């Protein structure tokens, strides 16, 4: 498991050279945006249920056969399992956003998950659609300018969305 | 590697739960200290060569026999001087790595786990490098808490 | 599934012996109560729509904010009303399943094992459905021991 | 009890070593946040009675049946009103305890571990107290990160 | 194990009342001096060996029969054991200073230690003298005004010294 | 595990005959040179670190990419592992020299070692070069006529060098 | 096989360390005694046939019935005499093996582990070979510590 | 304690048998080497003070800062000189103990097991004592195998 | 377990002084008589059965009720057990003679043996008589001047006999 500092240190050690001014500047920018990153992580974790609810609402709205008799979640068990899956994926996205690196999300979650879903018979495309809707809802909620000090969070939003396409592409 | 952020994430993951307010407080402490850590790293990296040469000369003045006695384990000729400068460069490079990472991880992993067998085999006395690191600590030109952080890790280096 | 007959048969089979007089007495009790159980199931199934609409209206009158406040988790528009009617229909359907089976098996298996995570995620308060089931219990039109049986399982439903 | 400082000390003691720089960073985060935590605690303690009365009145206006229906579990008379004010006082008291301690420890230990059996036995619906805590959150008069901290623990309270 | 906040919260919960303005003011003062407390803890831990060396030097200077043939530490084993004991006591003092409460030092260290020392035959009075010399050396080193920002650390010095007499009185 | 006496006794027992005067003379010569053999073993073991240092110096001098960034030992771990390997091989050579037979070195060390090195990706040719440099350094140090009584140690030097080519040929 | 040198090497190897001064002292003792051991081996090997014939004749004179009674287990004819000479030759051969090796290893491994079943099956009394070895011990012509060593191993042979 | 004789006796006793020829050979090696061991011990004990003073002066000439810098861990005054002479006396005393006993036992038990914590705590660099022991090794005035034995144990002392 | 060298080293270390010339001279005399000591140990171990036989013969000659019906060894079991005991005591005496110190004989054998014999009902006085007869036989056999180089072994004989009275006094 690596974060940004650990990745930079490993890549500089394997080559045996001091850190260039570029890497120092990048890590100093990471440090400067650390407070925005903590804001994003706190807001995403403490509003996790609302994000999951919005994503599920959209997914069941555009693919209603999912919640109709004979569908792939027409019961308390499968509904709760889908919601657990969605909360898990959001939790690992919050991990990657706090770490500033996708290594934990790729290695511990996105490895072998695609095989699991097609072995279980769960349609992966609808999972990817739900993940994209999670991305939309999460970015909408993070950028909410109320109750906070005005500022630019565009880089973090881009990074979090990049994590989301990495998650969606690992099951599509 | 052993960083506070990775340790917090592993603690949160081992119990299968979202991140708690304690871990966010710890990451906040890490982010607030990383400013001084990065300032110290930048300073030590920019003035690297001056520090290397000053430390080498301090070693020569403090242990004069190292410049006089013949033998491969000494710095009586140019080859020894260059090897010693390379060694002090390795030391400074790994201390800056550790300052960047924010923990003793790089020092524990890349230097200390193998330094003892290396020094016994090639008859290199640790007090030479102790004196070099003491010079670097006394002549890094940092002030305040950034200097305090640098000195923390330098003292970690001293306990070879 | 967990029915008295299947439980008796499993008890008899685990010891590799014929059925004892105790198990036949238990099956006799099951058969004698199944008359009232089936009467209650038939009644609740025939008057399903009236009960659904009355329970929805009781919920609206008891918690008026659910008809006034905007927001997706409320029944301010037609979509919310239809979802709520569907939910109460699920509740009544599974209670009738349990009445038919003669035990808490269907309620334990198809509803209660997943209701809590569903309600937390979509911000649905259990007291809405508690009030709906209370209305259904007070307005099912059954009399005697069949009503008693229905109320037994309705109270099982209340302890969400 | 579960505080960040006690957790750091226990982590340091279990490995029989001096305190590391990571634990001092964490204690630094705790000390820097304790200013906002104590400001929020002081504010919530000073305006305690106003908040209690406003929350009680919000509960009465939101669930009007609680003022109309007879029965011991309701607030139709003075005894019910006084019990409800005492209950909301318990809630606010323990949330201020948790704000003072800097963690969920007091909430986990003094309230949540026994609230469920209490509420089932005396037929107290959790949504009453949910609405009271929502009012308190919307009307505590705090601004900035101190308010953010208060809201963090209030949301911890909401997930009853 | 309690710190100051936990002790105050427990004592207020056992009585069932909100925190009085006195306790709030005291804990706010603790918060305000937290940075001085971190300075004391860092300086005491990173200079632990020098403190132990000074204390041992003084103790062997005023009680030289300790390091003379027939004495109670005239060997590598007993010398190293005494130094280990001294480093342990200093470590637990640093714990109590960081916690702002003596509960860890009393409960986990000072309970049954006096019985241990007289059962082992180690003279407890000289241990108390060494502890007092540790107190003197530690307070001298903490108050050093060089390399730091000018300020008042008298309350912390009094508290740390109070921990030291608690330690010395538990073995005297 | 066999020494010279045990090998001769086994080979004579498998044929069922008394020892010929040739074998008796050979073993008596071994006995006569036993003191020289003890001198060689003592000097080789008590100067092991200097031998390893000289060998490593030569090897890194003629193959400098070994100690340059990207090389196969550019770190404390791989350096210490190479030195451990070298000390191990020298230790087993001292075993074989004291025993007067290569059976221990062949059976317990040189069996499967070549497979280990190519499975690990360590270049065996440079290992053989380092072994040859160990041979040169060890023979130089053993024949040092200072501090000892003058005498002929040519047979032992030849035997030890034979052990060294057996070691070098087992990994080349 | 069990020699002092192999035992020292195995002791040193089992703990993964270089050879200690104790093991070199033991090997020194082995080397100093090997001179007498080899002298005794050479002497016993050169005069082998004389010793064999003298021991056979001593056995015949001491137990005369072995030359008189008929029966396959006796030495009444030439076949018995030749078998007995072969047997005493085996004994002397293995004792010289043990003298060469410097330990009881060869005697423990090649002779004693199977001698008992052999002697019981073919009705060979051990006292015959005891007397033969006593004669060999009294008539080997060795002097001093070499003789002492030979007698040590001969007494090892006596305790059949 | 760990002597060759005690080790042989313990090996013989653990198997409940009389002493074998191997153990007597080992004790013979011990007895033959004890002559040189005792000669070296007597010589090192007689010339103790000359060696102590020469080693102290060698340390002062090799590391001149030890005579110049102020500070308690140095030999700038008479107290430091006397402490250093006492230390070198301890070293020589324990090496002579080990020479007398014939093994590394006394060095393992009375010095090495505690030297590291002592030197770290009082900031004593091991290279001082390394240089002192090197001087003693180069200036003990012994010749032959007795000198070889002394140097063996001195090199054991060097690997601090 | 101590030998002479270890005892002297311990007693000198507990006092913290170099070895006096007296102790050096004593240990040098021990070294000089080491060869006589090895002769005594070898002759006593390789003739152990004859010593035991002579001792038992004398003991049964002067106390014949031991081997008469109703006696304390009138059977194969008790006879073999007595002979085992006698061989054990002789073995530990050979240990003490090789070590040049009685510590092993006192600590591992003579501790609790007297209690064992009176708890078993074996008459300890006759055991002491048999031990004294072992002493006489062993000293007679050790001093045999045949087959050896002429020399003085009086000190060793006195020491071995001292071990014997220590053994006999531990059961009498
Ligand atoms: C919901 C968005 C979709 C879907 C979900 C669904 N899943 C199951 C079962 C499983 N889901 C997982 C996923 C994970 N388990 C982990 O530990 C992790 C990482 C930490 C992940 C990502 C697994 C392993 C299973 C199988 C084992 C289990 O159930 O725990 C079901 C039930 C299928 C069935 O009952 O036949 C469902 C329904 N269904 C949908 O319709 C959505 C597209
Ligand atoms: C980005 C998504 C949005 C945003 C971020 C933003 N916040 C500030 C204010 C701050 N928020 C924090 C966060 C924490 N402090 C803690 O102790 C904890 C854990 C309990 C957290 C999560 C901090 C430290 C600050 C700075 C101090 C303050 O109170 O203001 C800013 C301005 C200051 C800055 O960027 O450093 C910004 C930009 N603002 C937006 O507009 C985005 C939508
Ligand atoms: C300089 C302060 C003193 C000193 C230097 C010196 N070194 C050598 C050889 C080596 N130095 C190292 C150290 C490291 N290599 C690593 O990868 C790491 C981890 C970061 C460390 C700490 C090593 C391994 C060697 C041996 C292998 C090599 O040469 O690279 C010499 C030459 C000695 C010889 O050839 O025998 C010298 C002179 N000596 C002094 O006198 C200076 C005071
Ligand atoms: C009606 C009494 C109140 C209420 C209804 C409401 N529900 C939703 C959405 C959901 N209802 C359920 C319940 C179940 N589905 C099952 O399979 C089972 C087991 C038998 C149960 C108990 C679920 C899972 C959902 C979410 C998924 C879905 O839509 O099917 C809404 C919409 C809320 C939203 O979109 O966010 C509403 C309004 N709300 C009220 O106000 C009524 C009082
Ligand atoms: C007020 C918001 C609503 C409500 C209040 C009410 N409570 C009772 C009785 C009890 N309330 C509690 C709660 C607690 N006691 C504790 O120690 C803690 C931990 C901090 C809690 C959360 C309990 C235990 C009781 C029962 C025992 C007691 O009386 O103390 C009543 C009376 C009900 C009755 O007598 O049956 C009432 C009315 N009811 C409403 O209608 C208000 C909206
Ligand atoms: C040194 C200042 C004094 C003294 C010390 C001394 N101690 C021993 C042995 C022990 N010391 C302890 C103390 C502790 N062990 C713990 O775990 C803790 C708390 C975490 C403490 C405070 C103990 C338990 C022992 C006995 C077990 C052990 O040794 O580990 C000795 C050795 C005594 C001897 O060898 O006979 C000594 C010398 N001696 C002095 O002269 C100083 C006054
Ligand atoms: C009291 C013993 C002495 C003293 C204390 C003092 N320090 C400041 C400066 C600061 N020291 C810290 C400490 C830390 N920051 C970290 O991140 C860590 C862990 C890595 C530590 C240990 C801090 C935060 C400050 C304040 C910021 C700054 O750099 O100045 C002061 C003045 C400011 C204050 O008190 O808050 C004081 C008084 N000064 C003395 O004279 C005493 C001898
Ligand atoms: C140094 C001269 C060369 C070289 C060495 C190197 N080795 C490794 C790892 C291993 N070396 C061994 C060898 C042995 N282990 C034994 O037990 C024995 C006999 C008792 C032998 C001979 C083994 C088994 C390994 C693998 C397991 C281990 O490491 O302990 C490395 C590290 C490789 C890496 O980190 O990728 C190295 C570098 N490297 C050189 O450049 C020299 C040619
Ligand atoms: C051969 C590499 C070199 C050499 C050997 C040599 N040595 C002697 C001297 C002796 N060395 C020993 C060795 C030991 N005695 C012990 O007790 C121990 C273990 C602690 C050892 C290792 C011995 C016994 C002797 C003989 C007695 C003496 O002190 O002289 C000689 C001459 C005598 C002989 O060969 O037997 C020789 C030749 N000399 C060289 O020139 C080679 C370089
Ligand atoms: C001679 C001293 C007395 C004696 C000799 C005798 N032996 C046989 C037959 C056998 N002797 C042996 C002994 C060994 N064979 C081995 O390999 C070893 C290990 C070194 C030993 C000790 C054996 C095995 C036999 C039987 C098999 C064989 O013949 O080789 C005889 C013939 C007896 C018969 O045929 O029944 C004799 C006469 N008998 C005397 O009277 C001599 C005093
Ligand atoms: C002299 C070579 C250098 C040196 C000497 C020095 N020592 C001290 C104090 C101590 N020396 C020891 C060493 C031992 N004591 C033992 O019992 C043993 C086992 C045999 C050893 C190895 C110890 C334990 C101490 C501290 C306790 C004591 O004083 O006895 C000093 C004084 C340092 C101070 O007071 O802080 C000095 C000067 N220093 C030099 O500069 C010399 C080169
Ligand atoms: C013979 C000289 C005398 C005597 C002996 C006798 N002993 C027993 C039984 C025992 N003898 C021992 C002694 C030892 N066991 C040990 O391990 C050691 C040290 C290593 C010693 C010294 C013990 C323990 C026993 C009891 C257990 C056992 O038998 O092994 C008997 C048998 C008594 C009976 O059968 O009733 C005898 C006869 N008897 C004499 O007449 C002699 C005086
Ligand atoms: C004392 C009981 C009697 C006695 C002793 C004596 N022996 C010598 C001769 C020697 N005996 C040995 C012993 C051994 N060498 C070994 O390798 C082994 C184990 C296999 C042993 C047991 C030795 C080394 C000698 C010296 C060399 C030699 O062969 O002569 C002497 C004279 C020499 C001396 O004392 O050192 C003596 C006195 N002689 C008596 O009269 C006592 C009855």
Numbering used by the authors:
A (entry chain H), E (entry chain F), F (entry chain P), I (entry chain N): 1 to 172
B (entry chain G), C (entry chain K), D (entry chain E), G (entry chain O), H (entry chain M): 1 to 160
What is written in the article reporting this PDB entry?
To avoid the effect of crystallization, the presence of hexameric (αβ)6 and octameric (αβ)8 states was further investigated via cryo-EM analysis. Cryo-EM micrographs and selected reference-free 2D class averages clearly showed two types of ring-shaped oligomeric assemblies in frozen-hydrated specimens as expected. Accordingly, each assembly could be subjected to single particle analysis, which resulted in reconstructions of hexameric (αβ)6 and octameric (αβ)8 states with overall resolutions of 3.06 and 3.71 Å, respectively. The EM reconstruction models were essentially isostructural to the crystal models (TlCPC-6: rmsd value of 1.14 Å over 1,923 Cα atoms; TlCPC-8: rmsd value of 1.39 Å over 2,565 Cα atoms), supporting the coexistence of conventional hexameric (αβ)6 and novel octameric (αβ)8 states in the frozen solution. These results strongly indicated that the concentrated solution of the native TlCPC contained hexamers and octamers. The local resolution maps of TlCPC-6 and TlCPC-8 showed relatively low resolutions at helices Cα, Dα, Aβ, Bβ, Cβ, Dβ, Fβ, and Gβ and in the loops D/Eα, D/Eβ, F/Gβ, and H/Iβ. Therefore, the structural fluctuations of these regions are relatively large regardless of the effects of crystal packings (X-ray) and damages induced by freezing processes (cryo-EM). The crystal and cryo-EM models of TlCPC-6 and TlCPC-8 clearly showed slight structural differences of monomer–monomer interfaces (helices Gα, Cβ, and Eβ and loop D/Eβ) and α–β subunit interfaces (helices Aα, Bα, Eα, Fα, Aβ, Bβ, Cβ, and Eβ) between TlCPC-6 and TlCPC-8; The superimposition of TlCPC-6 and TlCPC-8 monomers showed that slight structural differences existed at helices Aα, Bα, Aβ, Bβ, Cβ, and Dβ and loops A/Bα, D/Eα, A/Bβ, and D/Eβ. Therefore, extended cyclic structures were possible because the flexible interfaces acted as “hinges”, which enabled to control of the curvatures of protein rings although TlCPC-6 and TlCPC-8 possessed the same amino acid sequences.
